[model samples]
Target: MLQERVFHINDRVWLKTGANTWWPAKVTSVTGVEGVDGRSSETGTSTVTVLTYPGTQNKATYKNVDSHSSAITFFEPSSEKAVTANEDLLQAIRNAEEDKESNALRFEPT
Candidate 1:
């Protein structure tokens, strides 16, 4: 039996691109499908859409435990300042979406 891994929108993650390489990414969305038998998908598959920095947007799916392990990893920033900057940028983006007024907010240089 297999279970789906949890992922959330707006989450910054590390996406594996090579055996020894992991790239910074942002989760954009997650979509899952159920088995036609109406219980759960035997595939237990989920499509994860992510935006990889260095500019790539890709949709990946989990097929097996090994694939899952290699596909994505949780992101952990090395410094508090880096984390704070990420939070600030995330908040600014959210604010821009919510506030239509141009003068309401400004995203500053880090």
Candidate 2:
């Protein structure tokens, strides 16, 4: 499901830590990409920019970070509602198996 959140240029968020932990972060940018057939509703992929809190910046700490390229599910503020209610959204997900796969093309952390 595609989830939507308002992540502006400098919004602060929590980077998920362990199973239930997340660290504070400041949004630097959003990578815009259209949503896939059934999974997302973004125009592209929209990723959050983050800054590791002091003392939390380390090579090992990075290990806890998940690769952004990994497939993600976006959720509506309250549920897994697609940003748009167009029927096309369902078609996109249904055709996912036969369509060209798209991954995050870039990471803008500056």
Candidate 3:
């Protein structure tokens, strides 16, 4: 689950944008309510917020990290250095999210 925390700030890391995949990002803020009980109203499935981009144009758009599934993750700067610097990786994810959206809208069920 992509849980939230107290502290908040930009920390260079990666966001799990899809299955068996993670993308580069920096934390923006995280709010926690412990996924508690009660008849509360909130599309509260989201908590972890981050800025991830495609390429090097500083287009890091905000993505609502999931709290019910694995989406957000952290990496130490040292470990981060070891990760491949794929400027195209983030863009690839963009396409997935992009096509997935319109394509789903185009499909139907019986």
Candidate 4:
């Protein structure tokens, strides 16, 4: 197998769940992955906390995502700060960063 990358800490959890396909997502809990946490589930679903950007879904909720039915991607942030970013959402991401503990061990590989 290749060195296929998995989800990382504070990852900008991407979802192709809709037409616009970009939603505001933060991983509240991820099970059934790799060494970062523990085993992968049979469904290979990721548990993500999502805020629907399109407003099609006004309420944010915890969702179980699978690989095929919907695609999931991630983006890691840097040490830099930006004013151009959305203050409310940035805080949302930051909150999860503080909430993240296992990803600390997930950070060890780097």
Best by TM-score: 3
Where is model 4 more than 4 Å wrong at Cα?
1-9, 30-37, 42-57, 66-70, 76-110
Lowest lDDT sum, 10 consecutive residues, model 3, at: 95-104
CA lDDT of each candidate?
0.39, 0.31, 0.45, 0.41
Clashing pairs in 1: 35-41
lDDT of 3 by residue, 6-67 (tens): 33344434555466445555554553445422223265443555554454443557655443
Candidate 3 wrong stretches, greater than 4 Å: 1-6, 18-21, 30-48, 66-69, 77-85, 89-110
Worst 10 residues of 1 by lDDT: 95-104
- Rank the candidate models, highest TM-score first: 3, 4, 1, 2
Deviation (Å) of 16 in candidate 3: 3.0
Better of 1 and 3 by TM-score: 3
TM-score of each: 0.35, 0.28, 0.36, 0.36
**Local accuracy of candidate 1 as per-residue lDDT tens digits, 36-77:** 322333555544434433322333333322124356665443
lDDT, residue 40, model 3 = 31
Query: Order of all candidates by lDDT, from best down to worst?
Result: 3, 4, 1, 2
Of 1 and 2, the candidate ahead on TM-score is 1
At residue 23, give the lDDT of candidate 3: 55
Q: What TM-score would you give candidate 2 relative to the actual structure? A: 0.28
Against the hidden true structure, what lDDT does model 2 obtain?
Answer: 0.31
